[PDB]
Write a protein that binds this ligand. Sequence first.
Ligand SMILES: Cc1ccc(S(=O)(=O)N2C[C@H]3CN(C(=O)NCc4ccc(Cl)cc4Cl)C[C@H]3C2)cc1
Length: 322
Amino acid sequence: APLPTSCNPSDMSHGYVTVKPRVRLHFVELGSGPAVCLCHGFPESWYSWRYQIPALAQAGYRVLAMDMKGYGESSAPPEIEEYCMEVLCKEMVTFLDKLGLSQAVFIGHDWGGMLVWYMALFYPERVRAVASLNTPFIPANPNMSPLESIKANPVFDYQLYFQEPGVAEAELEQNLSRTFKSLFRASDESVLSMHKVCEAGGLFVNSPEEPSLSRMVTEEEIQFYVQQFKKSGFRGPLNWYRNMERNWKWACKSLGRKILIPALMVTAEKDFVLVPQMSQHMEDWIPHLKRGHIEDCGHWTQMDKPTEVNQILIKWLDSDAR
Ligand SMILES: Cc1ccc(S(=O)(=O)N2C[C@H]3CN(C(=O)NCc4ccc(Cl)cc4Cl)C[C@H]3C2)cc1
């Protein structure tokens, strides 16, 4: 079952676009062909797509893999409201403008999946096609506060823990190697319960001080993440979670419009947070939706099942984005 080719950071083309005076976005770029913009989740990196970038370039695409705002070599302003979906999506539009791209295909995972859905919803003229790994498209519900909705799903308890600035930062920054080795695990290897984080008082309070390495990752890979998060830390990344009311109000401005462009939703059997069933009935909002499903795959889709991800994405790109 041999691993796809990966990426060596020093061997990549590194690009930088200043979207505003204080905000510069970094990306890596490989390949010729139609532009495909890969958008990672929390707390990840462009390098989360290391197994996809060569494969998609070989398949005849120009891949732009982002450091999202708050991450890596991209700017990480401290202000919470710099990380609301309205701001982040408008910055990605400006990014396309500065690159001289009329459209791109957007592929996202986790919080990057949420972003690419909103790009498709509000900026469809700039989105050739959209794919999400794990993250569903959920229509805005103007009758339920985001607070209500969170409290009504217990696996989302960690999200409240992430609200108060500084608290989760201290825990996640205390020992970066422990942070990433604890998080980046296959489902069966989990050392963390995302429930009752608040009563425990932290994500890792009941996890090993010296976790083993997951089968999914090497020490060298973990240390790449460590080095990246030494640049700006966890405040910007966590700020993505601290705009729930603002994001809800923005999402309500879609006045029940549909997403009419080609779309792909990929579910992961063993993601016990972003569960497959959350995607049910997306077809009601997205008439041209196609689906994929990956068995034996947890939250960290790209590194858990890279071969399967690559096969799904290339088949869909070739049929629906080109
Ligand atoms: C309008 C709306 C649209 C989609 C959603 S969601 O799909 O429920 N989801 C998407 C975001 C990703 N996320 C998150 O916490 N990711 C990190 C993570 C996950 C799973 C594991 Cl195992 C470890 C880690 Cl660290 C929460 C955010 C909420 C909610 C509301």
